[PDB]
Amino acid sequence: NAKILIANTGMDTDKIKIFGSRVRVDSTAKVAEIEHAEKEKMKEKVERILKHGINCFINRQLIYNYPEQLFGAA
Amino acid sequence: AGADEERAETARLSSFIGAIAIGDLVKSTLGPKGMDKILLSSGRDASLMVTNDGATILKNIGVDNPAAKVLVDMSRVQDDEVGDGTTSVTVLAAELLREAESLIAKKIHPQTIIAGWREATKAARQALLNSAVDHGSDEVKFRQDLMNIAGTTLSSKLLTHHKDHFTKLAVEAVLRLKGSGNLEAIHVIKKLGGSLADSYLDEGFLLDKKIGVNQPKRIENAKILIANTGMDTDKIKIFGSRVRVDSTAKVAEIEHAEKEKMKEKVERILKHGINCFINRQLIYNYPEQLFGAAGVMAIEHADFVGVERLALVTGGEIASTFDHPELVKLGSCKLIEEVMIGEDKLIHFSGVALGEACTIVLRGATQQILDEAERSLHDALCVLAQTVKDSRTVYGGGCSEMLMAHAVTQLASRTPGKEAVAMESYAKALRMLPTIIADNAGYDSADLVAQLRAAHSEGKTTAGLDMKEGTIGDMSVLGITESFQVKRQVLLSAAEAAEVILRVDNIIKAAPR
Amino acid sequence: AGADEERAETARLSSFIGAIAIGDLVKSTLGPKGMDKILLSSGRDASLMVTNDGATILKNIGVDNPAAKVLVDMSRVQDDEVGDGTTSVTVLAAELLREAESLIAKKIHPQTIIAGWREATKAARQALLNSAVDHGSDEVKFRQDLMNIAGTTLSSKLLTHHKDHFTKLAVEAVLRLKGSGNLEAIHVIKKLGGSLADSYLDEGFLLDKKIGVNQPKRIENAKILIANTGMDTDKIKIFGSRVRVDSTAKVAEIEHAEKEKMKEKVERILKHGINCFINRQLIYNYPEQLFGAAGVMAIEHADFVGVERLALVTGGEIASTFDHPELVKLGSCKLIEEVMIGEDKLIHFSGVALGEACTIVLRGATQQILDEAERSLHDALCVLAQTVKDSRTVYGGGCSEMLMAHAVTQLASRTPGKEAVAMESYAKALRMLPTIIADNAGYDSADLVAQLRAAHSEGKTTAGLDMKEGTIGDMSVLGITESFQVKRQVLLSAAEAAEVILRVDNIIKAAPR
């Protein structure tokens, strides 16, 4: 059912160009919220994707690992 | 200036030199008597490789600049068709070059001489689509499976006292690989313990590795797990830094977190009944204690290549995160155990449902000769697959060469003498082979040639050189045969490979000054 | 390629040279007056190895390109079945090559000549049926236990002035060894001193370690403790992880925790009266202070192999964690002490109730030759095991060789001319052995040959070469005998080993890596 998606930007996210710097945290537990932000990025990719019927994605660069699990199930 | 200086007389010479050096080594090899050769190199080579088969030795190493490696390369293509039995194709081509010395006597035009190669196609067509073959080989076929040509291939090889039994085993191996595969998933190893059989046939794949000091000796109703990712865990994305705590109570979670990793592996594992785990990499220590108590055997840094064959065998699996145990994993269960073969300790995987991929285990007496068997397997598998597919064969022992030689002698006088000298020479190339078969026997070469020619001339294809007899006899009784297409390609190939460098007078230079 | 290539006279010659080189070094070794040889080579050797036993040295080193390494490998298979005693099998095969010089006075096919090897089979049978041999040596046995073959193996060794007494002792050691126990628990060390006996038999085990300079000098009514796990504490299965504690006050509790490991050990120790503790690995310092005050002798990093042997001897133990002392462990209680037998101190374990697992300690002059005994005694254990198992033997001192030689001379003439030349060459090979044994004696070799042949042809199997006399004598009085299978295998092995070298003509080596 092949539909094609091409992206100028990688699936990789973090630095943007405004770092928020190298990050502290009193306990390991606080760093958990940071992981959650990454999760939102996965979900946006799937929510829009299912509606189109997306069968294949082609990216000219490195690809972030989280979406990869998503694509496999879909 | 640049490129290599060859045209006219020097160019012919490089082809000439390559052919003579190769022929002496291969000539010894032909026939049941066949002599084994030992070759020595010490850096990237384990030990002297005897390599009785001529085709295997030429391809493995490209020793020098003169042209011959490409001529050699074609023989494997022939091998794909069949191309083995006993090597003879390379020798005939080399002797074509010997009378080229005679050709300088003519002193002017080599092109008239060239039309002779076309003549050879006419001459060699009387060897293929002619004579008789055998008409057996229904495919699968239980009693015609071997005790024939494979034994003949091995007749030249020294090991054939106990070895001939091994050759018989190989056809069973070809029959099991029958199907939609091609030539893949065959693993062969050998052992230092002596027994009459000298080999054993196993139902599955063999791998040499062990989990550690602790763990159960054997498992039954075994289930197999393969993981892409190692069991090592901690830093992931964002280490969370290196942590200094405020007090003892906060640090409780770190030690406990490791336990969860242990819990997922045990709880998921127990339902399945997991008997064995294979990982192609380093493995974390915590699970190792669990596997021993559970009754599960794991493999550290298993070779990736071993794993891939195993996957076809067990039905495969999808390798990812700990979600892996259950349905995403397919387990094929018969018996997985570590067993003792005479002396060495090995782990055996067996009982494949698929049947598509299998492994052969060879034992042997304890000899230089024993390492020879490893050489033998590559040759064994190739001979039999082609023999069933071609459905055609020719008589070995020099029977094929003499018959053709009788036909070619007539041809030379037919053509005008200047042309005839070139055509006759191709024809006498055949004559030297009869001489060699008899010479290695120890019998007088002169007497043998005269008697050999008389029987072939008569019309009996079966008759050939009986080395054991010292005279001539029936080749068919011996059971020595060569495949039909080994002959079709050799006659076409020998001529044009040599021809491409003799056809041309002035050639390839660029622009020196 | 550029690999070494040889024809006719040179090819045969490379094989010819290898056989002659080995024979001169080995000849000194044979029979009751053998010579000790020391070989030195640079790199991956370390120190001088002197081997009286011919088989051990050939196996170890592949000095050069000329082929002989494969011939050497065959001796070991023989060794498992019987092996040692005296080495003569290699020598006989080498001399068969000398007559091949006469073979050039022929020229075409050596294989008809090869009929001699079949003839050699005929020779093997004559050896095996003729003579008289020995019968029983059935089991345990009172006076037939030694003063026979072990003495002869030693006879070729110089030490046999007082040494023959030592050889006699070794059979008693094999009697305990033999059974379903297989080959386990045998350890032998020579020591400084001076006595006529030159050896002591220890019912227990000999060790060389000390707790420290302090501790009781002698322990009586000794209790023995063996621990698999070390005295070191700080790991566990659950870590309590990386340790940082809010302030400095808490760390004091941890040191106190260490005291509990010390204290648990003492409480269990005092009731038992523990006299000795042996641990296979690193030992923690706290317990060390404890053992000294208690009056307990401990051993640090004792070798594991010594320990397993000891367990069978004492009554064994379930060597686990510190719960280990008491009923769960069985301790023999005769006497354990550190004794300066002469000027060097060792620790003696003795007085074992079980009776089957002993250790032998030897006394000698003070220098290498005594260590020669270490070489010889280890060899001795193998000799006795085979003699009882084979149930077959032949007379020593070369008695066997001359008798067979008399029979073979008739055989050469019996066959027709060409067979006779080859048949007689094999026969003359036996002649050198009588000469080799006499020459090392110190008596002129030529005188010895004539007298020897006359006595053997008479029909007396017992008569042989007596080096001590300077003439010939009765072998049986001496008590010298050779295991029977050494003779079956040498004759069978010698033929095909040598034969493969000759059967292949004009060895050619080319086109490798």
PDB file of C-alpha atoms in Angstrom, chain B residues 24-25 27-28 35-41 45 48 57-58 60-61 63 158 244-248 251 254-255 259 286 289 366 368 440-443, chain C residues 1-3 5 7 65 70 73-74 76-77 108-109 111 237-242 244-246 250 500 503-513:
ATOM      1  CA  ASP B  24      53.647 -30.942 -14.126  1.00  0.00           C
ATOM      2  CA  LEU B  25      51.869 -30.535 -10.744  1.00  0.00           C
ATOM      3  CA  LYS B  27      49.637 -34.351 -14.282  1.00  0.00           C
ATOM      4  CA  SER B  28      50.649 -36.446 -11.209  1.00  0.00           C
ATOM      5  CA  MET B  35      49.907 -38.204  -5.926  1.00  0.00           C
ATOM      6  CA  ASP B  36      49.203 -35.917  -2.976  1.00  0.00           C
ATOM      7  CA  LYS B  37      51.278 -32.772  -2.687  1.00  0.00           C
ATOM      8  CA  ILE B  38      52.251 -30.800   0.424  1.00  0.00           C
ATOM      9  CA  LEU B  39      52.530 -27.017   0.284  1.00  0.00           C
ATOM     10  CA  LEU B  40      54.109 -24.810   2.948  1.00  0.00           C
ATOM     11  CA  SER B  41      53.452 -21.227   4.014  1.00  0.00           C
ATOM     12  CA  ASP B  45      48.172 -20.670   6.513  1.00  0.00           C
ATOM     13  CA  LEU B  48      50.684 -27.565   4.715  1.00  0.00           C
ATOM     14  CA  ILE B  57      44.806 -25.092  -5.287  1.00  0.00           C
ATOM     15  CA  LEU B  58      44.991 -22.716  -8.286  1.00  0.00           C
ATOM     16  CA  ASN B  60      43.072 -20.076  -3.516  1.00  0.00           C
ATOM     17  CA  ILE B  61      46.340 -18.344  -4.414  1.00  0.00           C
ATOM     18  CA  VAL B  63      51.205 -16.334  -6.812  1.00  0.00           C
ATOM     19  CA  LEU B 158      45.576 -41.683  -0.312  1.00  0.00           C
ATOM     20  CA  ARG B 244      26.818  10.770  45.332  1.00  0.00           C
ATOM     21  CA  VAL B 245      23.950  10.169  47.786  1.00  0.00           C
ATOM     22  CA  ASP B 246      22.878  12.150  50.882  1.00  0.00           C
ATOM     23  CA  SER B 247      22.343   9.029  53.025  1.00  0.00           C
ATOM     24  CA  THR B 248      22.092   5.200  52.858  1.00  0.00           C
ATOM     25  CA  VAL B 251      20.644   4.334  47.425  1.00  0.00           C
ATOM     26  CA  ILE B 254      19.907   1.446  42.497  1.00  0.00           C
ATOM     27  CA  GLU B 255      20.643  -2.053  43.881  1.00  0.00           C
ATOM     28  CA  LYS B 259      16.934  -6.953  40.555  1.00  0.00           C
ATOM     29  CA  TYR B 286      23.497 -11.504  37.324  1.00  0.00           C
ATOM     30  CA  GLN B 289      23.646 -17.313  38.425  1.00  0.00           C
ATOM     31  CA  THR B 366      44.557 -39.652  14.129  1.00  0.00           C
ATOM     32  CA  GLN B 368      48.009 -36.124   8.646  1.00  0.00           C
ATOM     33  CA  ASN B 440      52.771 -43.442 -12.819  1.00  0.00           C
ATOM     34  CA  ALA B 441      51.809 -47.150 -12.815  1.00  0.00           C
ATOM     35  CA  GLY B 442      55.487 -48.146 -13.142  1.00  0.00           C
ATOM     36  CA  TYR B 443      54.837 -50.097 -16.361  1.00  0.00           C
TER      37      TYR B 443
ATOM     38  CA  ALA C   1      55.895 -21.990  -7.626  1.00  0.00           C
ATOM     39  CA  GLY C   2      59.270 -21.490  -5.906  1.00  0.00           C
ATOM     40  CA  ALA C   3      58.818 -24.357  -3.396  1.00  0.00           C
ATOM     41  CA  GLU C   5      61.338 -29.650  -5.691  1.00  0.00           C
ATOM     42  CA  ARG C   7      63.616 -35.918  -8.301  1.00  0.00           C
ATOM     43  CA  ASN C  65      61.864 -29.150   7.192  1.00  0.00           C
ATOM     44  CA  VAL C  70      54.782 -37.993  11.224  1.00  0.00           C
ATOM     45  CA  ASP C  73      53.713 -39.446  16.033  1.00  0.00           C
ATOM     46  CA  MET C  74      53.017 -43.234  15.607  1.00  0.00           C
ATOM     47  CA  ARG C  76      52.622 -42.499  21.059  1.00  0.00           C
ATOM     48  CA  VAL C  77      49.655 -44.674  19.963  1.00  0.00           C
ATOM     49  CA  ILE C 108      61.672 -48.983 -12.787  1.00  0.00           C
ATOM     50  CA  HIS C 109      59.020 -50.071 -10.266  1.00  0.00           C
ATOM     51  CA  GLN C 111      56.285 -51.457  -5.877  1.00  0.00           C
ATOM     52  CA  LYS C 237      25.741 -12.189  46.402  1.00  0.00           C
ATOM     53  CA  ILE C 238      23.971  -8.964  47.294  1.00  0.00           C
ATOM     54  CA  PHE C 239      26.406  -6.045  47.456  1.00  0.00           C
ATOM     55  CA  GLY C 240      24.859  -3.381  49.653  1.00  0.00           C
ATOM     56  CA  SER C 241      26.448  -1.508  46.734  1.00  0.00           C
ATOM     57  CA  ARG C 242      28.954   1.343  46.477  1.00  0.00           C
ATOM     58  CA  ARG C 244      29.385   6.089  51.197  1.00  0.00           C
ATOM     59  CA  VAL C 245      28.095   6.693  54.711  1.00  0.00           C
ATOM     60  CA  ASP C 246      26.786   9.988  56.131  1.00  0.00           C
ATOM     61  CA  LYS C 250      29.480   4.445  61.128  1.00  0.00           C
ATOM     62  CA  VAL C 500      54.374 -44.535   2.194  1.00  0.00           C
ATOM     63  CA  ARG C 503      55.417 -45.801  -2.680  1.00  0.00           C
ATOM     64  CA  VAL C 504      55.325 -42.204  -3.865  1.00  0.00           C
ATOM     65  CA  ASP C 505      57.866 -41.517  -6.645  1.00  0.00           C
ATOM     66  CA  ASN C 506      59.331 -38.234  -7.711  1.00  0.00           C
ATOM     67  CA  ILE C 507      57.775 -36.030  -5.001  1.00  0.00           C
ATOM     68  CA  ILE C 508      56.993 -32.631  -6.544  1.00  0.00           C
ATOM     69  CA  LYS C 509      55.923 -29.530  -4.537  1.00  0.00           C
ATOM     70  CA  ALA C 510      54.461 -26.367  -6.238  1.00  0.00           C
ATOM     71  CA  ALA C 511      51.964 -23.463  -6.698  1.00  0.00           C
ATOM     72  CA  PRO C 512      50.900 -22.599  -3.096  1.00  0.00           C
ATOM     73  CA  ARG C 513      50.451 -19.382  -1.088  1.00  0.00           C
TER      74      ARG C 513
END
